[PDB]
Structures are given as C-alpha cells and as structure tokens.
C-alpha cells in the first residue's frame, strides 16, 4: 500500500529539488547545500507533489515565483491617466491604489464554455430521441410538449440559439470549402497525375534553395566584374518591362469627414 | 534533454505506463496538507526559540524580530488581522481540490472569469440555479420562540423516499415561512 | 489566421462586451534580457508569437531543461510563447465564427437597407 | 465632425422594440433583410454640426 | 445525414464571394460621458 508518485518524481528521483529562480550567488549556494541535506534536514519542504503529501511551487528567494503576466493593455486609472504600456517594462510594476488597477486574470486564457442544462430537461430530451428512433417523429407529440413545459425558458432559448450558431458555423465551414476547392488559373486541367513524386523535405533548405543570397555558397565566388555585367543585362530586360505601369486611381479617403476605408497600408511611410 | 524527460517511458509498455502514472490506486486517507502545516507552523516554533536569544540589548532583538517578521510577511502579506489572506504558491497535482470536484459552483468561481455584456446582468442560467433553495437546519437557539418550542418538538423518522432533495429541514430562502426571521444580506 | 506582421488592435476588441484583454504585439524588450549571445533577425520579431518561440529555443540550446533553464528570462519566454499561441488560437476561432463580436465588423451593429426605413 | 461620428456601442434595448414573433400572430410575416455593408458614415456640412 | 436530420434553408454558395470592403472604426477605452459636473 505504498503512496503513488507522479511522473515528475521519476525525472528528479527526489521530492526535494531546491529549485529557486533567483539567480543570486547567496540563493543558489544555499539551495545546493539545502538540496544535499534534504534527507536529514527537518527544515525541508517538498516541491514535487505526491499522493500522500502536497508540495510547494517554485521559490523566489524567500518568497514564491510566478511568471510575469502576459502583457495586457487593459487598465483602470484612479487619480490621473498613466498611459500604461505593458511593453515598456520587463516586469509589471505593482499596482498602487491611487495610480492604477490592472485587468482581471493575471494568469488567464480565453476559452469557450457551456452551461449544463437541468437534469429533468435532459431526461425529456433523452425520452424524445428514444421515442423518435423507435416510434418515429410523428408519434412524439407528448414527449415534445414535456420539453417545452418542463425545460425552463432560459434553456429553450439556449436550445434555440445553439441551432442558429451551428447553422452559422455550418455556412462558415462550407464557404471555406468553396474557396479551398476552387480551381485557380495556375491549376486548370491539372490532376493527381501531374503531381510530382516529392515530399515535405523536398521543399526545405537542403533541396530547395531559399530566396536569399547567403543561404548557401552559390554566390560566394562572384566578383565585382560579374556584377557590373549583370547590372547591364537586367537593365536590358527592363527596356521591355518598364513600358507598362498601372494608372493612378482616385483616393477613396479624400474626404476627412467621411468614414475611411481600411485600405491596405503602404509598405513604407 | 527532451529525450531525457521520456527515459522512464521507453522501458515501459503503454499498459505499464497507465497502471503506473494514471491508474494510481485511490487512497484518500493521507494528510496531504501536512507539508503546509510543517512549513508555516515552523514560524511559530521558530519564534519560541528565537524569542529566547541571549542578546543583551533590547533594541538589538528589536532588529532580529524585525528581520524575522520580514521573512514571514513575504508569505502572510498584511500584518493586520482580519484584513486579508496570506499568499502561498503550491504545486499543481491531480489532487488539487479533490474533495470538492463534485460541486459545480466551486468550479465556476475558481476557473471562469465571465465577460460582462451590454445588458449588464448575471447569466439567467446562473440566476435560475441560484434560486433552487438550499437546505437550512431547523435547530435554532437564536430565535427565542424556537428556543422554547423546539424543546417540546418530537423528532420523528424521515423515511427515505428515494430522492436526494427531501426537505426534512427548512429552506434557505428569505420568503420561506420558517426562515423569514433570518436576515439575508 | 493573420497573414501579416501587423494587425489593428481595435479589430480584436469587442464592441458589445467589456474589453478585459488585448492582443498586443510581441514584447521586444524581453529579447534584451537574455544574457548570452544569440543571432536574431529583425524580419522575424513582428509575426505573432514567433519571437517568444525563437527565444525559447535559444534558451533551450544555451541551457538545457534542468536546473539551468529555470531562470526568469527563460521561463517568461516559454510562458509567453505558450500563452500567445493559446490566446491567438481562441481569437482566431472567435474571428472565424464570431466576427460580429469585434469592432470594425459590419455585423456588430448592422446598417439597415433603405427598404426598411419606409421612405 | 469626429463627435458627430462618435457613436456608442450596442444601441438601445431590442426588447423594447417590436417583435417578429408577434407580427406573425398579427397577420404580417416580416421579410428578413441583409446588412448594408457598402455605406460609409460621413459628417454633414459645417452648418449642421 | 447519419441518421440525423438538421433542417436548414437552401444554401446560396454565391454568398462566399461577397465584396465587403473593410471600414475604419476605432474603439476608445477612455472617452466622454453624458454629463459632467
């Protein structure tokens, strides 16, 4: 009847790995000393949990460690506008009562959840489907009325909205299907037979050279003489391609008192 | 180093891995929180030995106790009582909150930070679940009518009818005829 | 998915809900906290969540995964990278199936057709 | 012009507006229209600001 | 579909290539109220 150990215990083989994140000499030397006497030291604390004993987290000197919260620009001012920028400092400064309040969830992520419908409302749904697959839809009126009556109205609204969402997602997935299965001009008339016997590695750096000059030793033996000659050839080809240029279009955002179009920004200011 | 993390898994089969690290035999008899009791209780035991220092000057021990209090306040935070709570970062394991996994409201309070909408209201489902009245004991010595009446009351057996919601006591609702004297604030 | 290095912050803020999180650009300041020498090209620092990924690699090469990687400059990079891809995965899904939640979308507050005004 | 084009989010309560479930039972089946995505808001002449 | 019926109206695949030019709209966390003292 031995206590169960987690996988992390087999990585370290001990419950007393004195992990301190503070990289000061005083701290790491004391941890190495404490890490060696943890077997016969009464002032020993575990950092690897087990079935029989809980554990502590990572240590920061005498205090405890937690990562810097992911940058979040949301803040709330009290006395004056601080213009808080989470990217201007490495570690987030503490929140003073008279200066700022930060957003909730220092350590939080964005997820999607769903409420659990009432148990009696679930049983009416199970009985309807069961009577449906057995006796058919046309003979489930009594089971349908029990749903509308026993299920509270807030649940019927959820059920009503679930159908509209999945109807929306159904369309959003089929539009992507249409754009994906569209045959572009560069693949007209091409089938699986016109595909090459190549795999993912054949498009990597070893087989397919990147579009950079110093990716390999291709242009390492080039001299200034060969360059001047190449500059003359590219200019020759430009004697036939520069003949065309797109015409200037009108500025749709000429009026400043008009909602401007979120047009693609220029590469450079 | 990424391969060194999987060393104990290469010598084992999948069934051995599951039986080893996943299917740990349930045993909820251990005093898991002894780790926290020993650590934090050591401050008090350490104060017993530290308050007996042979330091002659009274103001030199003032400095020592000021340093010892600094060590504690890194965990306790607020020195005043009835003001706040201490802060201890603990390890995350499968046995966190193991005896309250059955309760749903405890999960929502710990995990979910809900985003307020324009119609600034608590979710209707959350409000509806909150009205299903909880069970409140009849025993009451705080209301003097019951302090007298309940001395002559006969406790009769409540025969189980097969449910988990038998209202054999009063209900924790302000509008209940046996709880209207209770102040819900 | 974002097919650029830059994105408008307002496009990832909610219009009918309280804004408690933003989708910030990469924190280039964390890159200067690495004490060791490393090579980083400026052409890879703006794309979302990739800077924190390369930093984690640089730290996992200089150090390992045991007793030396556990320093604040390296753990914050690993935590940022793991958190950046989780938030961006949720925002990307929310942008795909809930575009009406965000500012700039014409469906957050639909403008009616002229046939609905009765003129 | 900027404050003329400064609106607040979410408008007014839709529940204080005529329902489509009610118009059906009254004898008029409403027609569902799409969102007008081609209009750009602009400010009027200065005299109306 | 797989022993399940999901009633939906006739889908119009032409809605996929709907030209929707993006428009500018900025949100200002921190702005103006209705009344001031």
């Amino acid at each position: 009847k031995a206590p169960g150990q987690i996988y992390a215990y087999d990585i370290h083989n001990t419950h007393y790995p004195y992990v301190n994140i503070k990289q000061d000499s005083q701290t790491q030397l004391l941890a190495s000393f404490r890490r060696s006497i943890a077997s016969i030291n009464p002032f020993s604390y575990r950092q690897v949990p087990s079935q029989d004993r809980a554990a502590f987290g990572l240590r920061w000197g005498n205090a405890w460690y937690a990562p810097n919260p992911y940058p979040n620009g949301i803040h709330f001012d009290r006395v004056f506008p601080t213009h808080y920028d989470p990217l201007a400092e490495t570690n987030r400064t503490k929140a003073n009562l008279q200066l700022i309040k930060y957003a909730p969830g220092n350590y939080s992520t964005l997820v999607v959840t769903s409420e659990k419908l009432p148990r009696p409302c679930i049983r009416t749904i199970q009985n309807y489907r069961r009577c449906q697959m057995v006796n058919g839809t046309e003979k489930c009126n009594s089971e349908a009325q029990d749903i509308l009556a026993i299920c509270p109205n807030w649940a019927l609204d959820h059920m009503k909205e679930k159908v509209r969402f999945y109807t929306k997602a159904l369309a959003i997935n089929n539009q992507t299907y249409i754009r994906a299965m569209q045959v572009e001009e560069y693949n007209q008339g091409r089938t699986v037979a016109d595909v090459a016997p190549k795999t993912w590695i054949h498009g990597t750096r070893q087989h397919l050279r990147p579009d950079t000059m110093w990716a390999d030793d291709r242009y390492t033996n080039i001299t200034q003489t060969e360059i001047n000659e190449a500059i003359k050839r590219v200019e020759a080809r430009k004697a036939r391609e520069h003949e065309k240029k797109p015409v200037e279009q009108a500025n749709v955002n000429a009026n400043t008192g008009e909602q401007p179009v979120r047009v693609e920004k220029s590469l450079y200011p | 180093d990424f391969a060194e993390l999987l060393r104990p898994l290469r010598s084992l089969s999948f069934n051995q891995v599951v039986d080893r690290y996943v299917l740990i035999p349930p045993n909820h008899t251990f005093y898991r929180n002894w780790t926290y009791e020993k650590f934090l209780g050591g401050f008090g035991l350490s104060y017993l030995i530290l308050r007996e220092l042979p330091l002659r000057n009274f103001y030199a021990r003032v400095f020592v106790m000021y340093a010892f209090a600094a060590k504690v306040l890194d965990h306790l935070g607020n020195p005043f009582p009835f003001s706040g709570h201490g802060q201890i970062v603990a390890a995350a394991d499968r046995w966190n909150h193991w005896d309250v996994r059955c309760y749903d409201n405890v999960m929502k309070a710990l995990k979910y930070i809900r985003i307020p909408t324009v119609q600034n209201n608590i979710p209707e489902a959350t409000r509806w679940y909150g009205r299903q009245p909880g069970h409140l004991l009849r025993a009451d010595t705080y209301w003097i009518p019951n302090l007298v009446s309940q001395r002559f009351a006969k406790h009769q057996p409540a025969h189980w009818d097969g449910t988990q919601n038998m209202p054999i006591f009063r209900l924790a609702d302000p509008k209940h005829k046996d709880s209207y004297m209770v102040q819900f604030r | 998915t974002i097919f650029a290095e830059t994105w408008e912050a307002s496009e990832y803020q909610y219009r009918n809900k309280a804004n408690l999180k933003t989708l910030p650009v990469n924190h280039l300041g964390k890159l200067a906290e690495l004490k060791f020498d490393f090579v980083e090209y400026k052409a890879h620092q703006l794309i979302a969540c990739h800077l924190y990924e390369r930093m984690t690699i640089h730290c996992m090469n200089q150090y390992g995964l045991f007793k030396d990687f556990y320093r604040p400059e390296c753990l914050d990079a690993q935590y940022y990278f793991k958190t950046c891809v989780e938030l961006n995965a949720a925002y990307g899904i929310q942008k795909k199936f809930f575009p009406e939640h965000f500012v700039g979308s014409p469906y957050a507050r639909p403008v009616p057709q002229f046939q609905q005004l009765g003129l | 012009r900027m404050r003329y084009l400064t609106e607040d989010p979410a408008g007014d309560d839709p529940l204080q507006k005529t329902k489509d479930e009610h118009l059906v039972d009254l004898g008029f089946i409403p027609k569902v229209f799409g969102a007008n995505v081609e209009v750009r808001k602009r400010a009027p002449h200065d005299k109306y600001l | 579909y797989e022993d399940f019926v999901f009633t939906t109206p006739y889908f119009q695949p032409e809605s996929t290539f709907k030209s929707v030019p993006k428009l500018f709209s900025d949100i200002l966390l921190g702005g103006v109220e209705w009344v001031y003292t």
Partner: peptide, 23 residues
C-alpha cells in the same frame, strides 16, 4: 461594459503626455 467607451469612425491621434489624455 466600460462607461467611458466610445466608437469613433474617423482617425484620431492621442497625445502621449504624462498626466494628460487628449486628442
């Protein structure tokens, strides 16, 4: 939802000055 929330349709530039917030 934040009380001091406004949606603007035209571009604006805010001053990056200490103790002040304005266009």
């Amino acid at each position: 939802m934040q009380n001091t929330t406004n949606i603007v349709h035209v571009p604006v530039h805010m001053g990056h000055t200490h103790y002040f917030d304005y266009i």
